[PDB]
Symmetry: C2
Subunit: 493 residues, 2 copies
């Protein structure tokens, strides 16, 4: 498992999925290797977005080892291109160059050298599949002897995040550091095609390393690593592929089942005061299938003194290529404390201060109120035109609808609330500490809602409370408990 | 006189001529004002060529006052444009820009801003009469409040050398500092059209200040300021315009006349040992009209133990627009110790390191031996094409002829010799300490050689020795001594 992962000191290839399993293990693996190694060598972690680089830097702590934590583009720029470009190509080339991602697309590698030599800027390649900065960095290393000496002397291992999005030119540099410079590589990626890719992503180079590489040591990560063992056993029994991984335990305490005989508010009081299996001071969230089921529970609790705020699923809450970025644009529009730098951190690459000012100009048109649906669509196209990303028609309408109304404001609110209620689709992504669900929502016999039920069960982190509303739900438990000869998988009050 | 010049603390306009009178007074005026002023304000001296700026910095000494000594282009770049361009035009414009003089000519002021904003370089104007850097610097001062505050706070007086070569845009900035910022200006220039002009020179702006400016205080400099009073009196009596300025002295000791009765070498021994009016340890130089007259004197002295090296006038020794620069190109080719940076210092403006490497590439073709007359002409055109200067046909042939032969090598030699012999045209420029001439060379009755004789007399600095070979020469002295009632103007041995 994870203990076997961190012990390996060689080239490690990690398959990460379900989210957050990659980030926590990455930070723990980095800080553990820093404690083992006392020599002068440092580590280098590279992330596509600037937020992930800042997220890793905050958890690691002091970087007195000289460790580099930053963007993929910022790494090759500050460590390879800028220091040794004059050594590789002569004194004609500048080291005070400014890289602009959006401007100055060129057709050939020879053309881009002239933009850097004469126009004093570092422009991107026109083809999204070919990266000019990494082609330049790899070229500089082969031309410059000092460049190869410095990289070997500075870093002994390099950590790479989200490797499935790396392009071929970006992939060539990483393999060049491992094959020629003999630098250890810790690779984290998602083998599934998924929904999120960098504009020049090719999953085959990552998939090819899993199939034909003898140097790397392959590992895998559990999807529900953060969930406790008792919650994992209750979640995995509903899907046939997941039933094999769980192991039975002599005593089960985290998953509680209680039949709904008293009103909904009384069940909440019973679990909080009579058995104290749920703490009122800990965050508590309740699961529903539809928005109406959440409203009636929220209104029933306001009468009993319980205070709650309910997050609804927005039109943007849909598996689309630009869903993650579109939500961040909404968070910058809705919230005043959300800085433009926080929005730029979500954008791939380390944008310059001048490029940030141009993107800020496009979005400032959305900060004026009551300017109708047509202008919101053009600002959105103008925004994504600079990023060279086309926008889905339903993604545009979903973005527009959220901008018009204040209905989905708290779903993108920066503030955090202790007690909430969310829909199964509302928080498909984020995870909660303790969750209560009801059985009548999910049809378990024909597996229509088993995927929504599996998501519902995996959201809870410490304690999961299940209400046995449906007899067919309880029958599917008792039937499969006999197939697997499981005496206890649930704790009933 | 000069004592009246340095005492004035206001705006001073100086008319300088005959050479070297401008540089010595400029350094003395600067260091004297630094001693008078104890406050934090500094001075700023600007010269067109980098050699003149380095020449002033060496004589001044320590610049702990923060005084700026450099090029006109380097002044507006480091003090106005680079610090306050972002304040004047916004954060879009860079402060790490690189100015290239030869590349990126543009037609309109708006076009050059885009080259600086996007292409990150500072290019020159296509029209030689219009300067873009000074148009940019003046524009930045009007746009930026801090820029005006810094210039007033830093400098209380600004010294300007060779003002007749300043263009109109360069002239507008200097007047803007005097009229708006109320900064004292010490201006040195030559009112005569002369032979040497910067490619965008307009003498009218300098001439216009002499005619219509009430703020400036006009002054004049003597042509033979370095020569002693006795030598000045002997030189000025031959030309009618010059006879009025000299004043008689009761005793004359510097100008010696001796009739040539003994051989030439014996006259040299007689003056050195019998009267000791010439020191063998001091530099001694003899004047002739033709090259044959110098050879026979040089050969006659080698027999008597006297050792001499004779500098001949080169084909480049001719009043042409590019004579000064062409000689420096020869000095870089002939001498190995003469650095390429010394050649770049003679070029107008502060050339960048990359621009220096391109000029060095063009001249390196002349360093190979025996490559005939045709290739020398093309390298010369290629050299001056970068400087945007056309070359006279006779200037090209004069440059070529010197390159072929080693005959004129010592005339451009970096080494310096104590005892020499030079032609009247050989050292029309440089001045010598003690000079001996002969009377038979100059026809004084019809004033054919009075200009060459006046040059001959003005070369000597401390002691001048005249040989009375011609009776017509001595008669013209005695005749004019009676017209002016001068009892003594010459010391006869």
């Amino acid at each position: 498992s994870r203990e076997q992962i961190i012990k390996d000191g060689g080239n490690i290839l990690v398959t990460a999925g379900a989210g957050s399993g990659k980030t926590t293990i990455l930070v723990s693996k980095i800080e553990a290797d820093l404690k083992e190694n006392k020599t002068h060598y440092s580590i280098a972690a590279v992330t596509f977005t600037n937020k992930a680089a800042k997220e890793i830097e905050g958890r690691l702590g002091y970087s007195s080892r000289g460790n580099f934590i930053g963007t993929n583009d910022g790494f090759v720029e500050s460590e390879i291109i800028r220091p040794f470009i004059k050594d590789a190509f002569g004194n004609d080339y500048p080291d005070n160059f400014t890289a602009e991602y959006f401007d100055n697309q060129f057709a050939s590698y020879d053309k881009g050298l002239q933009v850097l030599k004469y126009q004093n800027i570092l422009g991107t390649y026109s083809n999204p599949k070919k990266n000019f900065k990494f082609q330049l960095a790899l070229d500089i290393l082969k031309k410059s002897l000092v460049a190869r000496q410095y990289i070997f002397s500075k870093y002994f291992k390099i950590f790479i995040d989200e490797y499935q999005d790396s392009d071929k030119d970006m992939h060539n540099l990483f393999m060049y550091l491992k094959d020629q410079l003999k630098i250890k590589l810790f690779i984290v990626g998602d083998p599934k095609q998924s929904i999120y890719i960098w504009r020049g992503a090719e999953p085959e180079n990552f998939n090819g390393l899993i199939e034909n590489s003898t140097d790397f040591n392959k590992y895998h990560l559990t999807s529900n690593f953060r969930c406790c063992q008792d919650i994992q056993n209750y979640s995995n029994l509903f899907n046939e592929e997941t039933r094999s991984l769980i192991k039975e335990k002599n005593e089960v305490q985290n998953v509680i089942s209680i039949a709904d005989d008293m009103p909904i508010s009384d069940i909440l009081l019973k679990l909080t005061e009579e058995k104290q299996v749920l703490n009122i001071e800990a965050e508590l969230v309740i699961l529903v299938r539809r928005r109406n089921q959440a409203i009636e529970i929220m209104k029933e609790l306001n009468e009993e003194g319980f205070n709650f705020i309910f997050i609804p699923q927005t039109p943007l809450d849909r598996a689309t290529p630009n869903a993650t970025l579109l939500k961040e644009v909404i968070k910058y529009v809705k919230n005043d404390r959300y800085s433009i730098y926080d929005l730029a951190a979500e954008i791939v690459g380390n944008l310059s201060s001048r490029e940030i000012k141009e993107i800020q100009k496009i979005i400032n048109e959305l900060l004026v109120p009551n300017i109708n649906q047509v202008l919101i669509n053009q600002v959105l196209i103008n925004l994504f035109a600079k990023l060279e990303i086309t926008l889905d028609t339903r993604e545009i309408t979903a973005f527009t609808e959220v901008m018009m109304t204040n209905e989905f404001d708290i779903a993108f609110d920066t503030n955090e609330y202790l007690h909430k209620i969310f829909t199964v689709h509302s928080a498909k992504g984020l995870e909660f500490n303790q969750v209560i669900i009801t059985a009548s929502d999910y049809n378990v016999h024909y597996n229509r809602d088993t995927n929504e039920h599996y998501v519902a069960t995996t959201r809870a982190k410490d304690k999961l409370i299940v209400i046995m509303d449906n007899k067919k739900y309880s029958d599917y438990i008792e039937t499969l408990m006999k197939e697997l000869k499981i005496k206890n998988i649930i704790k009933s009050i």
